[PDB]
């Protein structure tokens, strides 16, 4: 799905995120809940306040799923098969929401890794998040 | 847009620190690199074949400054965005034929650039206010389309 | 919306022949089958697991009639769509939390259904007028979101 | 990209379109130009009036590319490789436009094949046109 060039930028950028993937995942979720309130309807069982242990624990799972995806850019549908069932079949997440979380993930990365967040890397990560998003909403296609 | 008095103050205090040239050139440059189809609208600008050519192109910087200057006018006029962007809405609609979807894209690229430039100071709370802002400008620009 | 006097007459002459129940049940039924995530909003309706269950479901038909009846009110009030859909915009925004993008989807499904029902009489010219119409309703409903 | 079930509905529906693919392609273009005027900017060298020999000749090529795609649902990126270069590289078509033409293609099919245009077939053709659209804008990803 991605170009060889894109894969190289993606694996490189994620190596700089390193062990902060969980933290960035939690921050991206917070920015999404505040900036796009409609998305909160999917988490009625969560305490969505800043510093919430739940969204921190959740951001860790999101961060870990993205690290998994980066180590499997050649077969995302397979590696993300179960997440696609969860999101499209069980939760029925509106596809528009995947674009909102992607924008908040890029925003978070820009805050934390300003020098690494170059125009070329930005474009590759956008294609990466677009690919993951397509895999997770694949049960609608 | 629906912004309290504490949000409006935070939104305005940040714009005091925004260099329209530096931020403007970057936002427009990243739109062209990240969403390549938008290049179609700026052929007259010359070479935009790769990210290096684009970011260093003088017409891209000059134009980006113009865009952000009008964005700043919207920020200082949040109570009448549709009046501030009336002529521009006609320009982009009647003459350029830009699909309104691209106004949302540039709006979000600007936010990412503000994030990059302001770091930790661009809090989740402040970004949320800026999302209402960019959305309100996007809507004011799409006005003349319907 | 920007509709001449000959377009408004064509748009209105067609609505004279629209059975709100038959067209309403079909449009809502097809939205739920074609864009499965929209089912999330109508759990109370019961079984919507397959296209057969959905199209024959009584609550789906009854609700579809309601939607098209309000659509008809917009058609007869093209000069003040935002006033006609003010309460509904608050309902879908504040209470239901429906992303405005789905209003455009249902708008386009309705057009496909009108095409299916009217055949050759649903000319490219008449469809163009109906696209401005569905777009204007979609915008009136998204109003309370910004 | 499509489910086996979807492929079956798609090949079946297209067999009913048969030799009218060119005509439906020309009609869909007309409905698009009138309903979504911004799309006309891509055809400055065309006479866009009803009955235009050019859009008829063009609708034939569009119809023929879709018939080709239906006979190759297992490998669209390959079969449509050159169209993807033309649309994304040379013309730089805005992705939003692919959704507009798809809607007008479905509208045209509904007018001409009302009994065949069932909810299940409609859903499959939507996924089909979404897939072709993704292949044609693939150079942005
Ligand atoms: C890059 C996009 C996304 C990724 C990688 C992702 C990843 C995940 C993961 C790893 C889980 C945990 C499942 C488990 O614990 O087994 C999850 C659950 C969930 N996701 Fe996503 N997700 C994404 C986008 C979204 C979006 C856009 C929404 C809605 C706005 C959403 C809503 C949910 C919900 C409600 C749950 C279940 C939470 C719970 O009950 O614990 N996800 N997702
Ligand atoms: C928030 C969105 C935008 C704002 C505030 C904005 C603002 C402006 C302004 C101030 C001008 C100059 C008008 C004048 O000098 O009279 C302009 C021109 C222009 N804009 Fe936009 N714009 C926006 C989005 C876009 C987008 C998304 C595109 C295309 C993808 C676009 C394409 C152009 C072009 C091609 C010109 C003419 C440039 C030239 O001088 O050759 N604009 N815009
Ligand atoms: C053109 C777009 C639409 C129109 C004209 C419309 C119209 C209506 C109307 C008239 C009602 C009843 C209000 C009342 O009885 O007070 C309603 C309720 C509702 N609408 Fe919409 N609607 C639109 C789009 C949508 C979409 C796209 C969705 C979801 C995907 C949606 C979800 C609902 C739900 C869940 C209800 C409440 C149903 C219940 O009684 O349980 N609507 N809408
Ligand atoms: C299902 C989607 C589409 C298909 C299958 C398709 C197919 C084609 C084909 C077969 C050609 C002819 C190329 C040749 O003669 O070698 C073509 C050309 C072209 N297409 Fe598309 N197209 C699609 C969507 C679009 C859209 C959405 C636009 C813009 C609104 C567009 C604009 C053009 C233009 C401007 C040309 C060149 C016309 C000429 O100069 O002869 N296409 N397309
Ligand atoms: C998912 N968050
Ligand atoms: C306009 N840029
Ligand atoms: C609303 N249906
Ligand atoms: C291409 N039409």
Author numbering:
A (entry chain A), D (entry chain A): 1 to 141
B (entry chain B), C (entry chain B): 1 to 146
Q: What does the article say, verbatim?
A:
Hemoglobin (Hb) is one of the best-characterized macromolecules and is regarded as an ideal model for studies of protein evolution, cooperativity and allostery. The release and uptake of protons by hemoglobin is known as the ‘Bohr effect’ and ionizable residues influenced by this effect are known as ‘Bohr groups’. In most models, Hb is proposed to exist in two states: a high O2 affinity R state and a low O2 affinity T state.
EqCNmetHb is a stable model for the liganded hemoglobin R state crystallized at physiological pH. Equine hemoglobin has 88% sequence identity to human hemoglobin and is considered to be isomorphous with human oxyhemoglobin, with most histidine positions conserved. The EqCNmetHb neutron structure was solved to 2.0 Å resolution using joint X-ray/neutron refinement, a resolution sufficient to accurately locate D atoms in macromolecules. The H+/D+ occupancies of these two residues are clearly influenced by neighboring conserved acidic groups: αHis20(B1) is hydrogen-bonded to αGlu23(B4) and βHis117(G19) is hydrogen-bonded to βGlu26(B8). All other His residues in the EqCNmetHb neutron structure were determined to be singly H+/D+-occupied (His0). In the EqCNmetHb R state, the Nδ1 atom of αHis103(G10) acts as a hydrogen-bond acceptor to a water which is bridged by another water to the side-chain N atom of βAsn108(G10).
